[PDB]
Amino acid sequence: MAIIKEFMRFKTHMEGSVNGHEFEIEGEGEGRPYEGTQTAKLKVTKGGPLPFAWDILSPQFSKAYVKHPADIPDYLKLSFPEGFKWERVMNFEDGGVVTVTQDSSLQDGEFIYKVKLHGTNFPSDGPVMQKKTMGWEASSERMYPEDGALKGEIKLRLKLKDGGHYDAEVKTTYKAKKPVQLPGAYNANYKLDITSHNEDYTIVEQYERCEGRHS
Numbered sequence: 001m002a003i004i005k006e007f008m009r010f011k012t013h014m015e016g017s018v019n020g021h022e023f024e025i026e027g028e029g030e031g032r033p034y035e036g037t038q039t040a041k042l043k044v045t046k047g048g049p050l051p052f053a054w055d056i057l058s059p060q061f062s063k064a065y066v067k068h069p070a071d072i073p074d075y076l077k078l079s080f081p082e083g084f085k086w087e088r089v090m091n092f093e094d095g096g097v098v099t100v101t102q103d104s105s106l107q108d109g110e111f112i113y114k115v116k117l118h119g120t121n122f123p124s125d126g127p128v129m130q131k132k133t134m135g136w137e138a139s140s141e142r143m144y145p146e147d148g149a150l151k152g153e154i155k156l157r158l159k160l161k162d163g164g165h166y167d168a169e170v171k172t173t174y175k176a177k178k179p180v181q182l183p184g185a186y187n188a189n190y191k192l193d194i195t196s197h198n199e200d201y202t203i204v205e206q207y208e209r210c211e212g213r214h215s
Contacts, residue, residue: 001081002106004033004064010111012040012061018098018119019129023047027061033077036067036211039195042204049200052122053133055158056090058192058206060100060115063174066188067211073183074212075150079176081106088172090156096122098168127158127166134159136192141170143212144185149175152188188212 007030014025024046031038040061044050063086068074076084083105090098098119105112122128141154154170189211196205 002109004077004080004106005109006032006034008033008064008111009109010038010040010062010113012042012113012115014057014060014115014117016057016115016117016119018050018052018056018117019122021047021051023050025057029062031065033065034067036065037207037209038062038065039205039207042206044202048202050202051129052119053128053131054194054197054201054204055133055135056096056098056119056128057117058194058204059090059136059156059170060088060102060117061206062111062113062208063210064104064111065208065210069213072186072212072214073181075176075180075182076104076174078180079104079178082177083111084174084176086172086174088170090168090170092122092128093167094123094126096120096126096128127160132161133166134161135194137165138189138191141172141188141190142185143183143188145182148179148182149173150182183212186212187215 010029012027027042029040063076088100100117103114137157141152152172156168158166192208
């Protein structure tokens, strides 16, 4: 219940199910919220090893860490200490769907994230269930004010191991727990990398850089 410092830590917990496969993940991260950089270390605590591509989970692990110029109100930083919630749908090009709900708060000097995720309708021979993906390309989320919340739309592109790409259309609503100043439409430009992973992807490290700007 405080301020966002130049250096901030986070703890995260995810409960999810993908194609009937139940799991939980606990993680710890850190970064520079005003620089727009962060890292996270995630561990599968239940249901590992996962039978599907880690990549569908990585974008679910932190919008307080977006670099904003002074002219674009930082709605999601402004939401603290009480914080914000978001809800997302990812529609993959072969019919697979992920939905996610998340709550973000600031407690005792650290961000606390709680994530719930459903994935379903991934084909058994597709790249997610066959683990044939190799990270996300850099992307730009179009952010805009609507219904008193901040909305985001992204066309995400997953690289495939054997060539080509696999797309998801992503729509998210981000809502502060109390009214704070919304921005005009802008672009949130992300690069998310898996920096390490053990054999079976039960311990994974990620890095993300995100900066908001006007096009």
